[PDB]
Design an enzyme around this catalytic site. Structure first.
Site, mmCIF file in Angstrom:
data_model
loop_
_atom_site.group_PDB
_atom_site.id
_atom_site.type_symbol
_atom_site.label_atom_id
_atom_site.label_comp_id
_atom_site.label_asym_id
_atom_site.label_seq_id
_atom_site.Cartn_x
_atom_site.Cartn_y
_atom_site.Cartn_z
ATOM 1 N N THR B 154 0.676 -0.721 0.135
ATOM 2 C CA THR B 154 -0.228 -0.117 -0.101
ATOM 3 C C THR B 154 0.812 1.421 -0.035
ATOM 4 O O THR B 154 2.008 1.679 1.002
ATOM 5 C CB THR B 154 -1.023 0.153 1.373
ATOM 6 O OG1 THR B 154 -1.766 0.841 0.541
ATOM 7 C CG2 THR B 154 -0.204 -0.198 2.617
ATOM 8 N N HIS B 210 0.578 -11.946 13.926
ATOM 9 C CA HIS B 210 1.556 -12.650 14.484
ATOM 10 C C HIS B 210 1.408 -14.485 14.740
ATOM 11 O O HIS B 210 1.470 -15.448 15.632
ATOM 12 C CB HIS B 210 1.256 -11.503 16.087
ATOM 13 C CG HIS B 210 2.980 -12.199 17.370
ATOM 14 N ND1 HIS B 210 3.733 -13.537 16.999
ATOM 15 C CD2 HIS B 210 3.846 -11.630 17.347
ATOM 16 C CE1 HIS B 210 4.606 -13.283 17.654
ATOM 17 N NE2 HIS B 210 5.097 -11.895 18.254
#
Ligand SMILES: CC(C)(COP(=O)(O)OP(=O)(O)OC[C@H]1O[C@@H](n2cnc3c(N)ncnc32)[C@H](O)[C@@H]1OP(=O)(O)O)[C@@H](O)C(=O)NCCC(=O)NCCSO
Ligand SMILES: CC(C)(COP(=O)(O)OP(=O)(O)OC[C@H]1O[C@@H](n2cnc3c(N)ncnc32)[C@H](O)[C@@H]1OP(=O)(O)O)[C@@H](O)C(=O)NCCC(=O)NCCSO
Ligand SMILES: CC(C)(COP(=O)(O)OP(=O)(O)OC[C@H]1O[C@@H](n2cnc3c(N)ncnc32)[C@H](O)[C@@H]1OP(=O)(O)O)[C@@H](O)C(=O)NCCC(=O)NCCSO
Lengths: 240, 240, 240
Positions: B154, B210
């Site tokens: 992005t 994570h």
């Protein structure tokens, strides 16, 4: 080889995946960032590295200086070395600082604990980190080594990061990252003159739980750590 | 005019609102930040801009260099080009890199996909970005253009930001932001001399899940990208 | 003394703990960061501090300049001064800017509101901040002072932070932090020459709700604020 396969994750990574997803849903995490001038600590470390490894048997890295300052600040700011019981709305302020240390291992990240870190000298901290990292990497940790932490320090700078937004794990209220210490041009102001110096700078991101610590409390806590590190009165603490 | 009214949101923004709220609740997102010296890429781009637009028909921006380095790193770090099945606890390591690209449009943000980006040269990437951005802005995307992504880039620097904490969308495990590339004073160290140079610097924030990637894995992945960009051996890759 | 005890949290901190945990679960928060050159504002503030305190009765800090620029930008970007009804999928664009201001107090963080801030001059803003901070610290706020906010400004720089990822509280869509304003070496480019100047720089982290604001909208909003502050045409606005 992993590319093009579907495989069950190992036991360390299964627990990490479940614990981190849950941790964010039961706390209000945010990450405040301060910058600290590590030049004096870097000079003291370079000067004393040979004498330290000769007397104490381990390499002197930056991590024991960060641990010493953080542990002192957790004693001075007991509101940060604390846990919130969301059912009773009661805060418990811990009388020990049991400092979790993140350790990168090939099987996954482990977070063993230095119990009663407030009683340790810099040489004791250096040896304890080396011990826990070796046992984490060689399958020799016991359950007491992985429980009871009251705060965590994670060396995000080991693999080059300037900063991160580390995930804290309740019942802890804070996790501090030690970013990569990098030489940077910075402004010095003295005698009414502004000038540009080369200094060893680090970013310290603190993720804190807003249930326990408000933003100004996080700033006061990080200011205590910053001032201790920048003054760098650690000569005596090295016991050389 | 919008001020003082209550109006139903458009279809793009309704999906974005639902997808982003849900994405954070089913993953463990955190954002690690590295800094990269883009000076050599900026020099190569300025030198070759006229020849590139003459031969390939599109303006050469920084984005194809970021895409080339990221896609190579997703092949070299297959653990990042992966998805986690939280029900079975199995990780799938994708054999293609289908690179989502964020595109700002007046109706809302769209995230079309460059399928099999690992097979593309820098000129092919440049043309594909121009094609997808034009089709996103003119209502010409098909369902296959908006599904199947394995990672996203992005361009947060388009509207001036230095950094952000982009939201990843499962089943992807990472989203990399390309901050604004800015001239900054930085320290060079060579031959034991520290000195201050003006360099084109960028921050690259990576939001990672994570559940899939631990912090040191994110750092190793970003280090591969940083080293590729800083060395800037892309002359041959431009095919000029 | 707190260390070694378990105690019920005070009323301010109980509400903060519940509101912040819930806020993250019902929104899609992310924090975009821009840097702004505050040198011209700092020069104007130093020059006019004595005349301002003489005419208006309060010290002139940086906060009224940030408030003036942010409030103008909330009028110019009505999409940011808005709330999303996730049940009806309708956006409400507010016709007033009711600006919440974070206030650190010994009992906890309070966020009182400057209603209709769009009608206020810089002297009116300065007085209103002083009034609300004094009443927050001395138990004199009423319910209307703590409700109806459409956006928030939090002075993260008060306790030294460069940046943070502040938590927004729905129905608001944005919360802007004013980092610590620090002298830094920066690159100036003029007449084709790049050079290094000492400038008063600040980081402005904006946490926005992705349900309401996409990343490029956040960047356009922050660009409006940055340009207003950097140009620093506020002499007339001080009414001195
Ligand atoms: C109520 C208030 C916002 C008022 O802030 P203020 O308008 O800056 O006033 P102040 O505190 O009296 O300012 C004291 C001085 O610090 C300066 N200062 C304050 N913020 C600053 C910043 N971000 N950067 C640089 N200087 C700053 C002021 O300009 C003033 O300078 P002088 O004495 O030279 O004129 C503040 O007292 C406060 O509570 N801040 C903390 C907000 C908070 O807790 N937020 C939660 C997230 S983290 O803190
Ligand atoms: C166990 C440990 C924390 C120990 O760290 P340590 O005490 O710094 O020891 P080390 O790795 O042997 O240090 C190697 C060198 O790097 C240096 N270094 C380490 N961290 C540094 C930092 N943040 N900035 C600058 N230099 C650093 C040390 O000072 C040492 O330098 P010398 O060789 O010149 O003396 C580390 O090996 C580790 O696992 N780090 C990663 C933690 C992690 O995975 N966290 C998760 C989030 S992101 O990584
Ligand atoms: C589709 C696209 C990604 C294409 O980006 P791009 O390949 O950089 O093309 P572009 O917009 O035509 O580039 C215009 C110019 O800005 C430059 N530029 C773009 N991004 C830049 C950055 N991060 N740093 C510095 N310069 C940049 C380009 O190099 C080009 O320069 P020249 O005119 O000198 O050649 C972009 O238009 C876009 O939509 N960006 C916004 C993405 C978004 O909304 N993300 C959501 C999170 S925040 O924005």
């Amino acid at each position: 080889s992993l590319r093009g396969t579907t495989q069950k994750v190992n036991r360390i990574r299964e627990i990490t995946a479940m614990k981190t997803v849950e941790a964010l849903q039961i706390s209000a995490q945010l990450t405040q960032l301060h910058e600290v001038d590590m030049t004096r600590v870097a000079e003291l470390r370079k000067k004393n590295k040979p004498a330290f490894i000769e007397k104490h048997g381990v390499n002197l890295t930056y991590l024991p200086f960060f641990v010493k300052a953080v542990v002192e600040a957790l004693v001075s700011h007991p509101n940060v070395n604390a846990s919130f019981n969301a059912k009773t709305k009661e805060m418990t302020y811990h009388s020990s600082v049991n400092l979790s240390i993140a350790v990168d291992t090939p099987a996954g990240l482990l977070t063993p604990v230095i119990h009663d870190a407030q009683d340790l000298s810099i040489p004791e901290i250096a040896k304890a980190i080396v011990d826990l990292a070796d046992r984490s990497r060689n399958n020799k940790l016991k359950p007491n080594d992985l429980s009871g932490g009251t705060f965590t320090i994670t060396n995000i700078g080991s693999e080059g990061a300037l900063s991160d937004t580390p995930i804290l794990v309740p019942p802890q209220a804070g996790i501090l990252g030690t970013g990569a210490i990098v030489k940077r041009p910075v402004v010095i102001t003295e005698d009414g003159i502004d000038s540009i110096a080369i200094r060893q700078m680090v970013f310290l991101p603190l993720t804190y739980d807003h249930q326990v610590v408000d933003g100004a409390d996080a700033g006061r806590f990080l200011t205590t750590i910053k001032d201790r590190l920048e003054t760098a009165n650690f000569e005596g603490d090295l016991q050389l």
